[PDB]
Design a protein around this ligand. Sequence first.
Ligand SMILES: *[C@H]1O[C@H](CO)[C@@H](O[C@H]2O[C@H](CO)[C@@H](O)[C@H](O)[C@H]2NC(C)=O)[C@H](O)[C@H]1NC(C)=O
Ligand SMILES: *[C@H]1O[C@H](CO)[C@@H](O[C@H]2O[C@H](CO)[C@@H](O)[C@H](O)[C@H]2NC(C)=O)[C@H](O)[C@H]1NC(C)=O
Ligand SMILES: [Mg+2]
Ligand SMILES: [Mg+2]
Lengths: 481, 481
Amino acid sequence: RPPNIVLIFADDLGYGDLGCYGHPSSTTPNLDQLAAGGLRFTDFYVPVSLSTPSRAALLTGRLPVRMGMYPGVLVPSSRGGLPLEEVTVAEVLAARGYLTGMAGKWHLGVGPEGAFLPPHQGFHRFLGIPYSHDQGPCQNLTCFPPATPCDGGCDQGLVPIPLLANLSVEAQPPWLPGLEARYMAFAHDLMADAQREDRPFFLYYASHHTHYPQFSGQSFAERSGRGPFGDSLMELDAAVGTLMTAIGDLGLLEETLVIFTADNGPETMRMSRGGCSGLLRCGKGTTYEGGVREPALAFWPGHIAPGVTHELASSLDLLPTLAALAGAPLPNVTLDGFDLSPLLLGTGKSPRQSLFFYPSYPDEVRGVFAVRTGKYKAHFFTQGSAHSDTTADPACHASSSLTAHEPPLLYDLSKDPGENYNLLGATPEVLQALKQLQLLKAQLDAAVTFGPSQVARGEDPALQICCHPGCTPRPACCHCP
Amino acid sequence: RPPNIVLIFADDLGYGDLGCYGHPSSTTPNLDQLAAGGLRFTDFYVPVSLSTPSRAALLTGRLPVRMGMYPGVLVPSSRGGLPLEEVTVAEVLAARGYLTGMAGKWHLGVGPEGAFLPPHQGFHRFLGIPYSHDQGPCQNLTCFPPATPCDGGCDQGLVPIPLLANLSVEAQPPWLPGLEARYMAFAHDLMADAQREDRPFFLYYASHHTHYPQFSGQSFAERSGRGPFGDSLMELDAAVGTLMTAIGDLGLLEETLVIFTADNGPETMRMSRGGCSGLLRCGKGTTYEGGVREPALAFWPGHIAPGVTHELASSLDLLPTLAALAGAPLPNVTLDGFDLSPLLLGTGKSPRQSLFFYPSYPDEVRGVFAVRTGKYKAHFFTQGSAHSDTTADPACHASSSLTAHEPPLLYDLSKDPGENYNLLGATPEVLQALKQLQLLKAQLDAAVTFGPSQVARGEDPALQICCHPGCTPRPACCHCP
Ligand SMILES: *[C@H]1O[C@H](CO)[C@@H](O[C@H]2O[C@H](CO)[C@@H](O)[C@H](O)[C@H]2NC(C)=O)[C@H](O)[C@H]1NC(C)=O
Ligand SMILES: *[C@H]1O[C@H](CO)[C@@H](O[C@H]2O[C@H](CO)[C@@H](O)[C@H](O)[C@H]2NC(C)=O)[C@H](O)[C@H]1NC(C)=O
Ligand SMILES: [Mg+2]
Ligand SMILES: [Mg+2]
């Protein structure tokens, strides 16, 4: 029987942040235990370094330009959304009779009467926030109890952040120091109800950690020894421990696949309240390894043996691997990932040879920015980003504008994961890798047509969720805490 | 009974190079296994980022300026050396009847008739090279068999690199692809002879890995997937596995303490043939965390439980911890380290609160460059270094000259291990940390007097070891391969 699947997706968490990936001061003991008894990926990626596009690619297994999830991210007034025609993972498992649930951040659009919310995209249950938790004013929110306010205020002129239950506003805004319990409790109930109906569950846990502003419940506040980013990562980690215990308590260890990853690199613009890309260069917002190479853990006792692969994998491969593993069939669409079960089960290698990376602002004349094949990565274009400012590497800053590279900047990621030493700027291994990387970009660029942008369809403030429909004056009247 | 102690010391190996410290492509499975069953330090340091000074501080537990081991490092023609009056670790254990042995790099001086070599400083046995393996021409040496030459040539106009056995030249130069077996074999014989005389051994294994030029025996050549730096680190790692097996085979697991660390940060000047400081800044040659924060593993089954401490420790603390653990008494000199056995055995905390860092070129008007207390590190002076050139961080380059900082640059290493965000440039926690850091530098600077420099005592080419004493023309006639 198809296994129970729990998929945890962190926010803005970098390759250097878990203790098991090197950080000297993070406290993440549950995730360190998953790694110890599971497969830890050294080379897993997402294809775009922002929340919306990355969340689209994970849920559909498709490159976000194919369905319009560019440029940038969706906002609360956004008209647009992940089109209802896309088939998400949830649709695929639900059809094979999984009881499917989602807690936490959606960021795939809201729309006219909530048309784009999770309940329309295959989730049976949903408790969470429809976009990112800083997309609403937070100067008066508490981030750390008893009364430590969130820092900097978040986005102004907006409705406060709403917690939803299917399409209804449960709270607005919610109490950040208690979000976690709400989500643990929703998770526990979905497990148990699934067990009791004799059915596999799919839990999609999109945490708010470790996105700005940082918050945690009172057990973690000031307990990690890495300040607010730490406390917030310790809570995420504790949360994981909790789901693992609940998996315990219902006798489901050997019957559940648990995967952890994160949507994109760290926001170093938040300085020491933001993540760490460890040795990789830059972060969120860029196509350097720091923004697109994420941590990734796969645990299934008695199916996946403890270890470390260096094989290539993407968040784009998760739909196809989970369909395979649950005996569900694939949507009838072009998919950009592959099944990795041979790699997970130890019977094979990853089928993936190449990875393609688009910028925050893609366009059809430039096409893909970077391509990785085997050990080699070519950058055809480079660009820094405000989400990665403040570090000492100047190629990460927003003042490093869009620069073309012809011939591309060429790195051997197995000896230079750091992306410091351009091999062109000329061996037969190299030149052969160069002609391949050039042919693969020209091939994808001639074959992908960009789906018309959802984000450019505009904003309308009337689309903001409001607790007290009709009230006045908007947006501040919208609120039922 | 005092335990058998094996102390492994790598060369130019950074905080980001072991697989267990985060590297995505290194292959170090034996050391990853030590960490898994031992205590892994996140915050262990050396006090000076070069080979000579660091090797002096480990062996005596004293700050290298106290006995003249500055500026820079010793060369083959050097007149000077670690003074014979210093009491090394080897002296301390030998006196309590350890059979003491050393394999690999000395770099503590040679001198007129080998007066400063290991056999005069407490080692019963010694097989190794009296300085660094690139300090002699290597354009004709093989680094990777069957016939891959060492890269770049090393130092010219010198006698070739000599392999010594006590004070005799065994080979000149030696066959780099076979150094490891020679050293494994010497280690095995010291174990066994110690077992058979009913006595504890002390093995001091100073590896040549991962110093330039890189080399390995034919089992590792081209096998790691990180190129020559990898192959060379895989061999070091395999070597460790071997000593662990020999510890197995003579029934000595529970009776031996094995420690691994490294003398100083990575030489990023060798680009992708050099190490990785992971998230820390810069490398070898500097007083940034990248040059002085090393990996460190302590393993003793049934004495030290598996885990991770964040407590402060230094290479300066090893003499005193090993004396304590062997019931030997301490030299009657000022020591700058502490016993850490409570921390190793789980009964206590590190006594160390503060760490002091000197530059490659110290001087008495400037005094210590940086000071760490608790979580805070102050830099009073900063300076880049040619050994750390070629990265994107400009503070590491040799073009970043000696700059004073008053008030000092102040970092909170628990949230900013990266040393990116200066907290001055002003909370009560901060200001209190600032007055302490200032008082501790002024205190050490008024109390340490610099021992007269050994390195300035000059060079004399007649002090170069020569296989064929008297031959002509020197240096090329010196050679018996
Ligand atoms: C809102 O919608 C879902 C789906 O109806 C609610 O669904 C569940 O509610 C009860 C148990 O949780 C039962 O009445 C229904 O069996 C159940 N439906 C399914 C398909 O499981 C759910 O409670 C709400 N979502 C959440 C948890 O917020
Ligand atoms: C050179 O010096 C040491 C010390 O004499 C040699 O010592 C050992 O040699 C034999 C066994 O290894 C025995 O003859 C002696 O017991 C022994 N001495 C001690 C104190 O162990 C040694 O072989 C040489 N050093 C090496 C290994 O190069
Ligand atoms: Mg994000
Ligand atoms: Mg060195």
